Amino acid sequence: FFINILTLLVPILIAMAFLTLVERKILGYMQLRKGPNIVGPYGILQPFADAMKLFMKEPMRPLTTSMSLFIIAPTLSLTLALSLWVPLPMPHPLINLNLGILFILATSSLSVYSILWSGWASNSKYSLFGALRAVAQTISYEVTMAIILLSVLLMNGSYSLQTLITTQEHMWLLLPAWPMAMMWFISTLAETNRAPFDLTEGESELVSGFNVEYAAGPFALFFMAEYTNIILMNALTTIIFLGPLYYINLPELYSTNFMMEALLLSSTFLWIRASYPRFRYDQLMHLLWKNFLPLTLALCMWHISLPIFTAGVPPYM
Amino acid sequence: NLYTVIFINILLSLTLILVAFWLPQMNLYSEKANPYECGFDPTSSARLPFSMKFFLVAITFLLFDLEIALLLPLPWAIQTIKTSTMMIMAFILVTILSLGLAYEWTQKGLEWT
Amino acid sequence: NNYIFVLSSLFLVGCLGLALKPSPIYGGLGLIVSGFVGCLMVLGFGGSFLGLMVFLIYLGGMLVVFGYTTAMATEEYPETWGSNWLILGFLVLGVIMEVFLICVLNYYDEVGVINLDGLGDWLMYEVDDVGVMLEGGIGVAAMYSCATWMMVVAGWSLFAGIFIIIEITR
Amino acid sequence: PFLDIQKKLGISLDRHFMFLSAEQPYKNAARCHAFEKEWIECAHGIGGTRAKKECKIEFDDFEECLLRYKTMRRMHDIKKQREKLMKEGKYTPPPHHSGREEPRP
Amino acid sequence: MPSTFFNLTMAFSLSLLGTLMFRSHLMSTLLCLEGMVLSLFIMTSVTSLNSNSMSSMPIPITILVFAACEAAVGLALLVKVSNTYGTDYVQNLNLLQ
Amino acid sequence: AGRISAFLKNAWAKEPVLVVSFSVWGLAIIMPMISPYTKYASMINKATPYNYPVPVRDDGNMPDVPSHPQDPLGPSLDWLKNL
Amino acid sequence: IVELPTLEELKVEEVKVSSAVLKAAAHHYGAQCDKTNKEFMLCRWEEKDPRRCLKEGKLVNGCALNFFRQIKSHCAEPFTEYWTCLDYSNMQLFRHCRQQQAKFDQCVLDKL
Amino acid sequence: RAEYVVTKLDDLINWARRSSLWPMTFGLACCAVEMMHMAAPRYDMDRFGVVFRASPRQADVMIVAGTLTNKMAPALRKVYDQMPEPRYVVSMGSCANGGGYYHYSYSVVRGCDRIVPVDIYVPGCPPTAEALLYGILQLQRKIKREQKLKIWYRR
Amino acid sequence: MWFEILPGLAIMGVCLVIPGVSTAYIHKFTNGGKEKRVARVQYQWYLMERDRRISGVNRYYVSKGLENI
């Protein structure tokens, strides 16, 4: 089991490091740059050197900060971001929860708790601004996102994650639920703070947000947690909505199709980052409570009525 | 199982904090540990009272989170035998939530003060 | 094997720190440590829905409770658990009172409350082995069908809560 | 009730989950369901003051079932006698209690 | 079970001692009130789990919804107190004598 | 009768999200009342085996309650196996 | 004294047949052995007495081993194919190996 | 042999800092446009792996661009002092080198050498984006050829 | 060109197709050619507990078919 822990936790770190590499390369090719060509064979040794620069640089111990929350927020942030992968399905999961969608929802809010403790105990006015726009960002996203997960699991009757692939064996859930799918992709952009809905990391209205005073080390480990959340909710959107064909004789063919689909979804995520301009904390909350919450309440209404109109009551397992 | 995965995640991130702190060289002084705000010292203390501007929409975020935790047993309540009163109860409370958000939308407290 | 008693002593420690009342920014951290402890307690007891449901509803409430602590009720030089020494002395006094309470509670009562090799054996009373519905999710699913007045009164509480909060914050 | 409007209109609104022995989703009976059923059907309109001396045996059996206090006391003296007998060395443990045997299903 | 339930009763007696005194803020008292919300949920779910009375599972979500709704009412009450004062403290509220 | 149509088309052109939400809301309200498969959901949730329906005692009285499980007597499921 | 039966009363021929192979011979068990099994559940729901229903416990164990004796004597090899195919899957889902089920029911209708 | 292991660990710890060094989204000048032109995709930062972060706690090298006035001097030293301990400074342009224009002004600090250490002086009023991309190559080889663990060993 | 990103994206695809294939193969090697049973309800857990007590070597995965009966 610990062999499965090490061989699931090491190559997800290699995968998010290469996600930061293909972020810099895909934003480069979007922006007519070439991306980090000069180190490694085509870029491969850049994020290993980024970790080996940012972990052999030192962090601060500031006077103004609180030291216990300063050292206990980023250890949480890497633990929760690497611990949302353990109920993820693949063919057969590392850990099969009975109800794992609530674990994904709650511990995804606990990542924003790590961000929020960084924002308060970093103890800058910039960091307090970043903490309160984390609060306003989750005020925008959280009710909408859980109504989306509820209203799609009115088609798959349990909260289990293997039940999603035995529901999505025959067809994807993009085709019955594309008004769910577009607003879920927008809401998980709001979850994982990417460049349309990236406030709270900021970089173009304020300086850094949650990691203003957080130097190298804990800023790197937040960066580890943030891009782990990027590849995580890319894979979660990939398994829940465009979940591929599932063969019980060939799970590796389905895993290759799932990984081509997940690299397409991650390229779509970074493509959205280098295609759209950035929101505001007022307009973000405004349209995620105005143009989303009546629409996702009506989609909750329609998927409540969907085991009555077409009489598909979902099974328990 | 899951307690051991959570604890090896604790051990991995604590090992990363220990290799982030104890291995690099570090000299620290008062201007280095001075808090950053644009290149100057801050005007007041950084924990001075914020006057909050999203307060009523913050409380209806809290009450909407209580409604979605009310609405969380509904994927197993779709399997019940009294499905007429189940769908009437789900209809009347999603109508209650849409009318409450429509009241807040007409009263225009979504904008800050 | 002693999971629920170790977690319940940790809940006693976290509610003791919340009871000893720091700056409420730090009190939200202590109460959400107690919330993770209680979610893991219900998930170790057999409620696979109720612990994660209180983690969702409590993380989502306590987020903006934390935001209201760091906006409204903040202070220039706050008090954590280690700032004020009467609070720190009360913390170590409550810790030694807790372990003195269990050190007198395994000896006075002569019943099965605390035993060094006989605690944790009386935790699961009865779950059905061949039954199919033993988790807590279908019973709280039954408030849509059997106990419909609960959902009527909770939806009216939230409707009146929206109207009452608009009238308070106006 | 004070205003007995549920008994007046004849519709149960909070009354169908009042005790432990009420009806349950998908017919899964609670623990001490038979004890609660025999306690209510022994207090079936007797009254409170006469019932607390009449069905005191059935309440005492149901309270013993629900809280298991004399049962945990019995198992506490059994486990204390097991620790005393293992410290004495008289009690050879059986292999069925030790677990080193083929089990029946 | 009686060790867990008596330690939850001790946690409620501790949070009673917490919300029955005031140190500097009304908000830490409201955090003690929400500690009472969490302690009553854990106590109700532990009682329903070991008694296996799964028909009374509508009760602890009603505990959470009503007690967190009145907690949200008190959180915006502290917002209106700090709006009408500018301060927040317990000793600020002696103007009704 | 042109004012309601002009207001509906103006809201459709300007802010169509509330129009789509109220239309899908009214469709979800009225579509169980239209569809004939509303009555099949209670049939599905009744005719699922979910516990053990226990055998009953007999004195030679009832003929509808069968003895063999493959008897034609009782509530059959030709509306579910074939449909 | 709460009465409990002795260990020699519980000296039955216990069925040494596993989970997925029992799930393979689930519906044929309910097809064939329907008198003794429903007698045992009628005892256990109107008597509430596991000290009393042991004498029908011997009958339902004898019917289960007679049913498996008929299968083992007559229809062993498509049963081994079908229960190995059912034991391959995760939750013993019946959908994955319906091709073996037609061979199993054709062999059972041929011989038994 | 231990000195070979020490020098190869020194090269392995300096390879990361010479490749993935992270500069500063600075400003202040005419010379702010040419930092943006090294960001521009003709002579490119990000091909080397040279990323404009905004925070001084996350930065690794400071590109001081152009004029450094008397009001800007604590607003430059405060930022450099809150850079963490591998701190390299490029001075873009002649006003950050020694005060190209406004050497004799009342309100220019006469170069960035008066305030912080500057590890490479890149001259021009335009340093072209290729010219201080050469400058980031020369700082890259400078902290390649520095010896930290070697003089930790012989000490 | 467009084929420049695809080496790094291909080793990303290899190193992210390795944990699901690795956890399916280690579930097969854990449960001896069979897959790990999932206990969504209590009946599946009592079924797996009875599977362990039928096998008798404290093992879920090995099972007694008609070779014992």
Ligand code: SF4
């Ligand atoms: S160095 Fe030249 S180009 Fe740069 S700020 Fe000075 S005058 Fe302008």
